[PDB]
Design a protein around this ligand. Structure first.
Ligand SMILES: *[C@@H]1O[C@H](CO)[C@@H](O[C@@H]2O[C@H](CO)[C@@H](O)[C@H](O)[C@H]2NC(C)=O)[C@H](O)[C@H]1NC(C)=O
Ligand SMILES: *[C@@H]1O[C@H](CO)[C@@H](O[C@@H]2O[C@H](CO)[C@@H](O)[C@H](O)[C@H]2NC(C)=O)[C@H](O)[C@H]1NC(C)=O
Ligand SMILES: *[C@@H]1O[C@H](CO)[C@@H](O[C@@H]2O[C@H](CO)[C@@H](O)[C@H](O)[C@H]2NC(C)=O)[C@H](O)[C@H]1NC(C)=O
Ligand SMILES: *[C@@H]1O[C@H](CO)[C@@H](O[C@@H]2O[C@H](CO)[C@@H](O)[C@H](O)[C@H]2NC(C)=O)[C@H](O)[C@H]1NC(C)=O
Ligand SMILES: *[C@@H]1O[C@H](CO)[C@@H](O[C@@H]2O[C@H](CO)[C@@H](O)[C@H](O)[C@H]2NC(C)=O)[C@H](O)[C@H]1NC(C)=O
Ligand SMILES: *[C@@H]1O[C@H](CO)[C@@H](O[C@@H]2O[C@H](CO)[C@@H](O)[C@H](O)[C@H]2NC(C)=O)[C@H](O)[C@H]1NC(C)=O
Ligand SMILES: *[C@@H]1O[C@H](CO)[C@@H](O[C@@H]2O[C@H](CO)[C@@H](O)[C@H](O)[C@H]2NC(C)=O)[C@H](O)[C@H]1NC(C)=O
Ligand SMILES: *[C@@H]1O[C@H](CO)[C@@H](O)[C@H](O)[C@H]1NC(C)=O
Ligand SMILES: *[C@@H]1O[C@H](CO)[C@@H](O)[C@H](O)[C@H]1NC(C)=O
Ligand SMILES: *[C@@H]1O[C@H](CO)[C@@H](O)[C@H](O)[C@H]1NC(C)=O
Ligand SMILES: *[C@@H]1O[C@H](CO)[C@@H](O)[C@H](O)[C@H]1NC(C)=O
Lengths: 168, 49, 212, 116, 49
């Protein structure tokens, strides 16, 4: 609040500051534009999905193990194990802090749906309706995309899944 | 009407507009202080011999 | 035909840059009528009821205020132009990559699979009309990674093995068009006990009958 | 004290002249029907429902408002539908048709050249 | 869009190596991308023509 930061309670100050024109209206407009842009930043990064997708109750993904990055059902926030690690590492004279439009429960719920879309449908949900495919076969499609022949995946499935699991 | 005045128009389009401020009001003025004290004689400053 | 209706009946990003510039130019002129702590806002009023030694002090109070206001105007225009510049730099990349080419980047030239793009000029900008392909009306089938036959493992050359319940075909992955599995649309590598999920089925050789 | 901005929520004068009022981060017991407390302040003139829709007018902290059920109401926005992929270790879905779609994208390239 | 909803061929846009797939995680005021890539290993030399 420009007027409350400058003058601040006093009344001899407000009539004198009234003589400067619209200097304080400009500053409030400038700060309000910034605050409206911060919600559009987050909407553009995270709300990139039509539906809220869910993973099936089994976890038969060809030997691949996604448990450290899928949501944790025993929590109020329902974050994953790595999202819990990341969140533990990071009134005045007219000053105020507004809250974001999206809670970070909502943000964690957008991210888990993006994850379940990928693990279950590959890249089809990003271009239309989600079309299920088994995870080993999707991994073999992706090996083709980098120019490796797709039996190199099926004949090395266990080793490839172990390497993924250790790197995670 | 306060929104129409803030925008300087007679037609407001859908949205949400900051229009003013709410500030609780304070009543009475409590002046606290300490106990002990004397009349503090100036009668040895202005009336010295 | 529907673009034409939806527009004839949305250009808010172009309207906002016009509005911002006009709102700033009006605030600049509306400052020519503030005192900033002087007796009036008119120089013909300080030069008419004050002698030159007293009008200097009152003219300087106006000069300082008006300089401040002009320089605020010029800073906010630099900051707004740096943002218009990035938008035009993105428009120049989309004209190269969506209009003079076919893009493979996901969600860069529409939503779907990019086919082609058409430009149209607008008052202070450009409209792209993106034409994309969207798949529709899906069915489920059952799949296998490979087919075992004669002790060998066969993989599709460019498709997927599918089953309608009792028979095994090859399709291409984005459009359903089943074909008989032959040695012309599959290739062989290895024996059929290392892949997990192999199914047993016959792979048809075209020469073997025809020759005989 | 409890100082704070005041915002006015309107469906648009071409729809109605009813209005709701947000007292930003003020406890709703010291404002001076429907009084509703939000993580973003005290809302007056909208009723709180239990449904969840797509966001219309953003209030904050997950709460949006709409002119639906009239008057003004509060609630928690909707992230989106709910799609459940029938994933299995040997099932695939393949499309049998397509649609040709065309969309627009609008971009500013210039602004007005002014001199002083 | 390009590393989570698809597979990228742009070099170094989604990590070091040949991009296989990417997973997002939310951070406070930010995002974390876990990029899975393929890295070749244990080469032999040969004669060629
Ligand atoms: C996925 O990986 C996790 C490891 O991050 C597995 O959970 C651990 O499993 C070991 C034994 O395999 C236990 O000693 C740990 O206590 C487990 N950690 C937990 C439960 O937090 C998990 O079992 C793997 N998933 C599958 C299906 O094997
Ligand atoms: C210095 O002494 C004189 C003499 O008493 C003080 O004058 C008295 O002032 C009070 C208040 O003005 C009167 O009620 C008395 O009648 C005055 N006395 C006489 C005799 O006239 C004077 O106040 C003393 N100076 C100071 C600073 O206290
Ligand atoms: C693919 O098959 C699955 C398996 O039945 C279908 O998904 C089920 O559909 C029924 C009816 O719509 C639902 O009640 C189930 O909840 C779904 N999921 C299951 C059973 O896991 C799906 O409809 C089929 N897809 C197509 C395109 O036919
Ligand atoms: C799977 O597709 C095959 C098509 O090759 C179907 O089998 C044929 O069906 C037609 C019409 O019913 C018959 O005239 C043929 O004799 C069948 N056999 C062959 C070798 O062509 C089969 O019915 C389909 N199965 C299901 C469950 O739809
Ligand atoms: C796929 O075909 C092979 C060969 O026809 C089957 O292998 C035979 O399986 C039976 C029953 O388990 C054994 O008695 C034979 O000794 C096997 N022969 C060989 C050469 O391995 C195989 O079982 C078939 N797979 C399925 C799922 O039926
Ligand atoms: C693929 O979808 C199109 C629609 O996009 C189908 O064509 C429509 O068919 C209905 C019924 O025959 C007609 O009323 C419409 O006029 C057709 N649309 C157009 C644009 O011509 C088509 O039949 C579908 N193909 C398959 C194999 O299902
Ligand atoms: C392939 O052969 C080349 C030589 O033609 C190897 O490079 C030699 O490597 C050794 C050990 O690092 C060096 O001491 C020599 O100086 C290298 N030769 C030259 C001419 O510089 C290379 O390491 C071999 N790579 C593989 C995978 O076998
Ligand atoms: C798929 O899962 C079923 C359990 O229903 C199991 O019997 C079968 O061996 C599995 N096959 C593959 C290829 O994973
Ligand atoms: C605005 O008013 C016009 C005419 O009164 C009407 O046609 C139009 O639908 C109104 N717009 C909205 C959003 O109600
Ligand atoms: C407002 O004040 C009351 C009285 O102390 C308190 O119970 C209530 O929790 C306060 N509001 C909030 C949002 O905490
Ligand atoms: C909304 O649902 C909750 C369930 O806990 C219930 O207690 C509450 O009364 C409901 N609100 C309304 C307005 O019905």
């Amino acid at each position: 609040d420009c007027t409350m930061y400058i003058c601040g309670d006093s009344t001899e100050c407000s009539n004198l500051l009234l003589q400067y024109g619209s200097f304080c209206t400009q500053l409030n407009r400038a700060l309000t534009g910034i605050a409206v842009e911060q919600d559009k930043n987050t909407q553009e990064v995270f709300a990139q999905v039509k539906q809220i997708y869910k993973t099936p109750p089994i976890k038969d993904f060809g030997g691949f193990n996604f448990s450290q990055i899928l949501p944790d059902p025993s929590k109020p926030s329902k974050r994953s194990p790595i999202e819990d690690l990341l969140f533990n590492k990071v009134k005045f004279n007219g000053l105020t802090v507004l809250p974001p439009l999206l809670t970070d429960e909502m943000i964690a719920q957008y991210t888990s749906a993006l994850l379940a879309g990928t693990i279950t449908s590959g890249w089809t949900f990003g271009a239309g309706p989600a079309l299920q495919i088994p995870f080993p076969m999707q991994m073999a499609y992706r090996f083709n995309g980098i120019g490796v022949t797709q039996n190199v995946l099926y004949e090395n499935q266990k080793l490839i899944a172990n390497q993924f699991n250790s790197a995670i | 009407s306060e929104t129409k005045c803030t925008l300087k128009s007679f037609t407001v389009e859908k949205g949400i507009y900051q229009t003013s401020n709410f500030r609780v009001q304070p009543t009475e003025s409590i002046v606290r202080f300490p106990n002990i004290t004397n009349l503090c004689p100036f009668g040895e400053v202005f009336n010295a011999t | 035909g529907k673009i034409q209706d939806s527009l004839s009946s949305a250009l808010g990003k172009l309207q906002n840059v016009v509005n911002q510039n006009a709102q700033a130019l009006n605030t600049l002129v509306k400052q020519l009528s503030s005192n900033f702590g002087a007796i009036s806002s008119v120089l013909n009023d300080i030069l008419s009821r004050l002698d030159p030694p007293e009008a200097e002090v009152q003219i300087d109070r106006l000069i300082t205020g008006r300089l401040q206001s002009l320089q605020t105007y010029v800073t906010q225009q630099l900051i707004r132009a740096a943002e218009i510049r990035a938008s035009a730099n993105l428009a120049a990349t989309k004209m190269s990559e969506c209009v003079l080419g076919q893009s493979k980047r996901v969600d860069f030239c529409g939503k779907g699979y990019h086919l082609m793009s058409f430009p149209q000029s607008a008052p202070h900008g450009v409209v792209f009309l993106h034409v994309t392909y969207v798949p529709a009306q899906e069915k489920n089938f059952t799949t296998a990674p490979a087919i075992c036959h004669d002790g060998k493992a066969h993989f599709p050359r460019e498709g997927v093995f599918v089953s309608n319940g009792t028979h095994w075909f090859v399709t291409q992955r984005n459009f359903y068009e089943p074909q008989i599995i032959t040695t012309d649309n599959t290739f062989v590598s290895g024996n059929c006990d290392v892949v997990i999920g192999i199914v047993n089925n016959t792979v048809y050789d075209p020469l073997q009958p025809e020759l005989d | 004290c409890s100082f704070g901005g005041v915002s006015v929520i309107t469906p648009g004068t071409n729809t109605s002249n009813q209005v709701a009022v947000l007292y930003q981060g003020v406890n709703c017991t010291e404002v001076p029907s429907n009084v509703f407390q939000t993580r973003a302040g005290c809302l007056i003139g909208a009723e709180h429902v239990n449904n969840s829709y797509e966001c219309d007018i953003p209030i904050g902290a997950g709460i949006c408002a709409s002119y639906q059920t009239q008057s003004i109401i509060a609630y928690t926005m909707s992230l989106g539908a709910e799609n459940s992929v029938a994933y299995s270790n040997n099932s695939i879905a393949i499309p049998t048709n397509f649609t040709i779609s065309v969309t627009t994208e609008i971009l500013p390239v210039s602004m007005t050249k002014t001199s002083v």
